Design a binder for this molecule. Structure first.
Ligand SMILES: CCCCCCCC/C=C\CCCCCCCC(=O)O[C@H](COC(=O)CCCCCCCCCCCCCCC)COP(=O)(O)OCCN
Ligand SMILES: CCCCCCCC/C=C\CCCCCCCC(=O)O[C@H](COC(=O)CCCCCCCCCCCCCCC)COP(=O)(O)OCCN
Ligand SMILES: N[C@@H](CC(=O)O)C(=O)O
Length: 416
């Protein structure tokens, strides 16, 4: 239909990278000239539409793919991949915080800076009592959990419904077996339709990449100056090492080619870089794991679980910025406090939601754990400096958050 058909036949990765580079350059240029408000007014809704189109698909691609994803045997294989993915999700985050501590000791973020105290003293952090957090996994209404966001109760109900369906398909009665296979066929048709709409929105994706990274560079790309450049380098070098020294080694020792893995997962990594949402990149992540031959029983359970639980980049970010704040305050922060940093940033990354900007909010817990409260002005002043470039750090940490889920899914699928 004209120039549109000439634009469609271009390969998706090439125009996604073209939108990435032409968003970064245009955003830096327009942000240096004070045109951040014009970008936020005009350019940003073209990326907001992309995040809306990605979040539209999330619930029918979790529920309908996990009901069909109970095609493996119900106790044995699902319990084995649940344990094998929970051990991976804890160990990679516990290494990610330690790599953040190593990179925050190599660099020195907040190397003796002194700063004024005029920012707002934000919020003393209080956690929910953790029996409500666990008891809210079981939903009191499955349709209410499907309508109110709530990926984590939807995982539980979809696992239960799929196990019940595969018990009904082995029944002696004929009407119950035909009804169960008709329900499974309809749910699988919904899942395949959603995987087609993922390919539909990945053609709009270059405009969304351009309009998202241009807005991010226009607002916050010019504030990366001074020691904020040091903490940005200490975060991004740490994320690069979190990929290369953890994920590539764990892919190599399990017989998976890491370069072919990156060639399969580029469409998920470059989407999570700009959308900054590990729960909005979930349809693209499930499409990537579908394309690389992973069976549905592995990825349909491990990826919506890993969208919230496995956050290695958020863990490394909370490991680095805690050292940044404790260096701006002048604290010694001994190894008995660094082990509590390792213990608390893992729980803070587990508790961090997949929306953009939640890691800076959940940083208050790992701040409060070591004896740096957020209520005093001298800590909140240094914490506002991290909130100045939270989006720049979030762009990389979300990509590492999604790459961790994909690496764990591929490793556990190679284990079976
Ligand atoms: C307001 C919202 C406007 C943006 C809406 C864009 C996408 C929403 C969902 C699109 C329908 C989903 C199903 C369409 C579909 O599957 O075909 C997909 C068709 O792709 C599209 O039509 C997306 C069109 C987005 C246009 C992007 C901006 C156009 C700019 C034109 C350039 C200047 C002229 C591709 O599928 P496939 O790779 O050929 O194979 C699929 C195998 N099943
Ligand atoms: C292994 C761990 C599996 C635990 C799966 C449930 C944990 C995620 C639930 C969740 O997102 O709640 C989050 C809980 O955040 C936290 O307080 C950290 C506690 C993590 C749970 C530790 C394992 C139980 C959201 O809390 P909020 O933002 O204050 O509202
Ligand atoms: N935006 C991050 C979470 C965070 O660190 O705030 C993610 O969803 O992966």
């Amino acid at each position: 239909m004209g120039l549109y058909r000439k634009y469609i036949e271009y390969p998706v990765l090439q125009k996604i990278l073209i939108g990435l580079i032409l968003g970064a350059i245009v955003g830096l240029i327009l942000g240096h000239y004070g045109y951040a408000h014009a970008v936020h007014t005009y350019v940003k809704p073209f990326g907001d539409l992309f995040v809306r189109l990605l979040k539209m698909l999330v619930m029918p691609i979790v529920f309908a793919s996990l009901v069909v994803g109970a095609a493996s045997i119900s106790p044995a294989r699902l319990g084995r991949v649940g344990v094998k993915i929970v051990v991976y999700y804890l160990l990679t985050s516990a290494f990610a915080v330690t790599l953040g501590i190593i990179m925050a000791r190599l660099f020195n973020p907040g190397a003796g800076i002194h700063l004024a105290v005029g920012g707002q003293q934000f919020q003393p952090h209080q956690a929910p009592p953790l029996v409500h957090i666990l008891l809210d996994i079981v939903p009191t209404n499955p349709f209410g959990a499907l309508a109110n966001g709530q990926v984590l109760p939807t995982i539980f109900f979809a696992i239960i419904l799929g196990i019940a369906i595969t018990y009904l398909m082995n029944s002696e009665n004929e009407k119950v077996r035909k009804s169960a296979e008709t329900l499974l066929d309809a749910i699988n048709g919904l899942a395949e339709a959603m995987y087609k709409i993922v390919n539909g929105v990945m053609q709009y994706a270059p405009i969304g990449v351009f309009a998202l990274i241009a807005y991010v560079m226009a607002e916050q790309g010019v504030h990366v100056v001074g020691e904020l450049a040091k903490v940005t380098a200490a975060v991004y070098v740490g994320l690069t090492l979190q990929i290369l020294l953890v994920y590539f080694v764990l892919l190599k020792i399990y017989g998976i080619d890491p370069i072919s893995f990156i060639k399969h997962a580029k469409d998920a990594m470059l989407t999570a870089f700009v959308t900054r949402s590990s729960s909005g990149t979930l349809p693209v992540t499930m499409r990537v794991a579908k394309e690389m031959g992973i069976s549905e029983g592995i990825y349909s359970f491990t990826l919506p679980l890993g969208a919230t639980i496995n956050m290695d980049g958020t863990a490394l970010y909370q490991g680095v910025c805690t050292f940044f704040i404790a260096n701006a305050l002048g604290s010694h922060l001994t190894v008995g406090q660094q082990l509590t940093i390792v213990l608390t940033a893992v729980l803070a990354s587990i508790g961090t939601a997949g929306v953009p900007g939640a890691g800076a909010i959940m940083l208050a817990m790992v701040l409060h754990s070591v004896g740096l409260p957020l209520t005093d002005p001298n800590v909140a002043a240094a914490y506002a400096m991290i909130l100045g470039i939270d989006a720049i750090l979030d762009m990389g940490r979300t990509m590492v958050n999604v790459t961790g889920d994909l690496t764990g899914t591929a490793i556990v699928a190679k284990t079976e």
